Design a protein around this nucleic acid. Sequence first.
DNA 1: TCGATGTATATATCTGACACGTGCCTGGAGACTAGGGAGTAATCCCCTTGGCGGTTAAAACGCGGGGGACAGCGCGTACGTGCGTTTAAGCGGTGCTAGAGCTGTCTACGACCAATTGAGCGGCCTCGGCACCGGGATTCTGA
DNA 2: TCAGAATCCCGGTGCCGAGGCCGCTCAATTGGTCGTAGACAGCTCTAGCACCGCTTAAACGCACGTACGCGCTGTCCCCCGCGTTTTAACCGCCAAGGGGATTACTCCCTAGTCTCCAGGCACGTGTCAGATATATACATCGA
Lengths: 78, 78, 103, 103, 108, 108, 94, 94, 51, 51
Amino acid sequence: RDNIQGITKPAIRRLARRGGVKRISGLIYEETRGVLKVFLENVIRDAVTYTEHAKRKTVTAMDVVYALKRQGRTLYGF
Amino acid sequence: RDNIQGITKPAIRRLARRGGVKRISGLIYEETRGVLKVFLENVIRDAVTYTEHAKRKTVTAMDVVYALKRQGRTLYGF
Amino acid sequence: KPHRYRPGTVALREIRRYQKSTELLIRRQPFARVVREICLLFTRGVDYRWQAMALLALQEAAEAFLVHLLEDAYLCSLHARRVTLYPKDLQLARRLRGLQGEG
Amino acid sequence: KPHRYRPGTVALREIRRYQKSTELLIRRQPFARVVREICLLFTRGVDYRWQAMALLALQEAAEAFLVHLLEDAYLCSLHARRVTLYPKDLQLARRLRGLQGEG
Amino acid sequence: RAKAKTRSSRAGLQFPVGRVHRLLRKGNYSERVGAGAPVYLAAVLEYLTAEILELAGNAARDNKKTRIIPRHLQLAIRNDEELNKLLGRVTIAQGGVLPNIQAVLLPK
Amino acid sequence: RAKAKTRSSRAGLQFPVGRVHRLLRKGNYSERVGAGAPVYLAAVLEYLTAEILELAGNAARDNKKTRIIPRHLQLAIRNDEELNKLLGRVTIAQGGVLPNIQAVLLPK
Amino acid sequence: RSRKESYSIYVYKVLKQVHPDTGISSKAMGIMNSFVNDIFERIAGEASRLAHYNKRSTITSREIQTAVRLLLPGELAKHAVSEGTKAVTKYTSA
Amino acid sequence: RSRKESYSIYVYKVLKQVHPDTGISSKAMGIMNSFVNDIFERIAGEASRLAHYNKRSTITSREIQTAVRLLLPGELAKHAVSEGTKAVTKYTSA
Amino acid sequence: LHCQIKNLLSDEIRQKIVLPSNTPNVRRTKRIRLKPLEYWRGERVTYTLKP
Amino acid sequence: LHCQIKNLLSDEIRQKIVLPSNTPNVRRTKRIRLKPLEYWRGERVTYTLKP
DNA sequence: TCGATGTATATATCTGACACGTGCCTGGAGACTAGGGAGTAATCCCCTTGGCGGTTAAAACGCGGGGGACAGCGCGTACGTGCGTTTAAGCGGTGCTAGAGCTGTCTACGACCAATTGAGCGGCCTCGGCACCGGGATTCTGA
DNA sequence: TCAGAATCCCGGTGCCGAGGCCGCTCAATTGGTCGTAGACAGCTCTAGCACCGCTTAAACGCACGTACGCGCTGTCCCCCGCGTTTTAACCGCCAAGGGGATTACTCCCTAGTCTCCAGGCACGTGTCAGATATATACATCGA
């Protein structure tokens, strides 16, 4: 019932076959979870400070684009 | 003479030993030359564009730092 | 007598399918749950008004970042001349990402 | 009847030397000539003056950049479990650099 | 009073110039903005958008789509070498990835 | 009139809040730069300079030298978490590379 | 009843200068709006640090020209300087 | 011979404030001056972006709080923000 | 100026460099169009420079 | 505040984390000092946060 | 395992790039507008609930076999290396000169003013791509 | 090699963002002006930009030699794959209610202006650190 376990291994396999991989070890199903978790921590830790400076109890997509720009991987469309 | 071979092979060898290489194939003596050449052609064009904007007929140590800082690999002490 | 296909090869059919379909690949609700976990982890337990279109923006961004690093790891493992994949390949590619993957 | 010792091991002494020393590793005059070879290629042939401080700074930047990418290539080849080095290792490492060394 | 005119039409262009000069002088980049700056901006921006839309339409005509999907923009960006260098650190929402397969994964 | 007393001495610190506010005037970051913000900048720069020079002096003591050559600076910034994360894009003039060997390289 | 601004009509016009026959999605429109805003602020930041580097409070077309020379790769700069110089010779007629 | 700008007196002052016993090379002096100039311009650019994002044309300490929380990683930023709050409570008392 | 006709022939001397076609009332820039051009081993501008 | 004494003990529970020593008239910050901490498999701040 | 043997880790001294003195300003400290920023504020509008119920598109499990992955060994190879001439380059100094910085002094030129006007938000509406559904074309896999 | 099962066009069909489309009213835009940033002149030191000898670390080189990568069982194991069986997220949808972008207002408290004035900033000198001798534990290969 862990929230981190909500990322399912066929969806992990879905992104894997999006990346186009022949075979995968089963070990990766938590390693990708940890990588995604620390990346989400990296962007959310800045996004909450962004909306904290905005002094609102919301989180807009502009804040996420600013957080990705501060991470250095800027995003379009929003 | 041809001057592209000025960056000689034991310079690459001692740079490898500072990088900590046990053994190295001999083909690298031109591959390092190529990657150093394209790195130089990256930085020096922007540097001379900087000096050109100053209309300066010399190259100044601040300008190359501005070029690499724009390139994203910054350097202090100059 | 029934008989079915070789391993790997019909998964490449799904690979060619997914490289043609540009949609999201993560179920929205577990992803929203797991990021609400992190904002509870940073807002001293309180929750914030998560804008719904911002959620799918972050969903797509994390998906693109993850498939990028994934194929990077598969490329380094194929440089190691083995057709499958290991977490050590991801570990090397994470290490050979620089601080771009860390901010 | 003189006797010999093993290869490679004393090169590690040179590794420990060059890690302890922080000076340059490239000769001044050939590097100056090859870097004055490029303003021929960019300033329409008519060359420019320089600064010797600028020469030292570009020297240090090129040395640090090259040694960093070099040890990156060495460790990525060591991921392939072979202690020696090949230029294809550098091809992977520069390929798994992203848009950083090239802008 | 003399009849005025838009300075973009005096430049004969389609991107606005008074608007982007308002963007510049209040966007707080420097203090003094010369008159020749935002016309040069509008010129290079019109060229860049014409470039990306020309490649986008050349992508979209292959799938016979009248409207332009973000997948078309993604394929046009990552298919051209030049603008991909400009947009290396940029990603696209719902753009997907290219058809890009390693060589030796295919069998005999 | 008044007695000679600077704002940084009124701050009781060792970094010039007037010169910093002069930079914020000239550097074109806002049209109005507030009161306490250059105070905050001089404060955090004082702290960060303390952070680098503490480990710098520690490395210089461990190599027993009067002045600090930037080898100590390079060894100091690359022996923590945050400053290495702060200065990932930064290289050092005459700082060299760390003593750093791999595990498989050691024979027996 | 709030007023914002964007470039979507300008994107629609420059669509007609290349493709007078095709349509456009709004997702692509937001991509384009983000794109022009990003490249605008990027080149403006480069121009600001450039003018800071030569102690000039003024910014002319020369600064933008050197900025797109240093920032844009390849023949994009070659066509961009021709576009800009042609546009300023067009505008300086009046 | 007109004027040159550095922070070298302040670098030496904070050096003796932390270590009254040792010295510094001029190479390290230039390293430190360039370091604090880079850190200052980076945090000032982030502060300008931040004040741009909520249309506060002023910039006060409150932008700097979120700015140094944004740029500096973790407990480094924690000690820095406590240092800055302590200094502004010192200054606002005076 | 006219060197795009020369540089295209200088690029024909074999590899995948998309020549821009010609259609009226379109923008249709004279920017020469390239292969995706993998960079870690690719070619460079050695023949599109003006002497 | 005083949690640095607790967080140091929270980190003492088989790792190389340099606690800062104590000497008068020096700055000697309370900034916790770390191993170089390889990042791709490293630990994180899971126990130096205020609940 | 014990021993020669080329290291580098001590040690004495002997010059030469640095840190405090020092006039000297030129950039920093007091007084006071005024007009953007904090604060209130009610108000519509998205979003977070908890629900439905269908549902189906996904997760778990077993087999299953097949096809990679170390594994180690056989073994030609090519780079390591250290002596042996060799070279050129980083040394010293030496005009020198063209070009980087410093004032000067005008002169074109961007902010800061009234006043229209057109263009981008706001329903709106065909409406036509187009997502979607049935159906009939293609191309992997053993016998 | 080729049924046969999995996929790529092909015609139809509701449908719902969407691209003009009308209104509209808030910033561009003309005029002009006014201090003023800088363009240009010109002058003056100065740092590469060439020169000369010198001497010393590099440059093949090669002779063993040794790791090292094809390759081959091999084996085993683990993992597509695939069918079956749960199963739970997803999708309209009600509703709700409540926080949050307002605009409106309404003070308040930080940039300019001016006037003193003094701590950073270009010039000198006694150094500790690089440099040069012993010497020495000390790793590194014989058998």
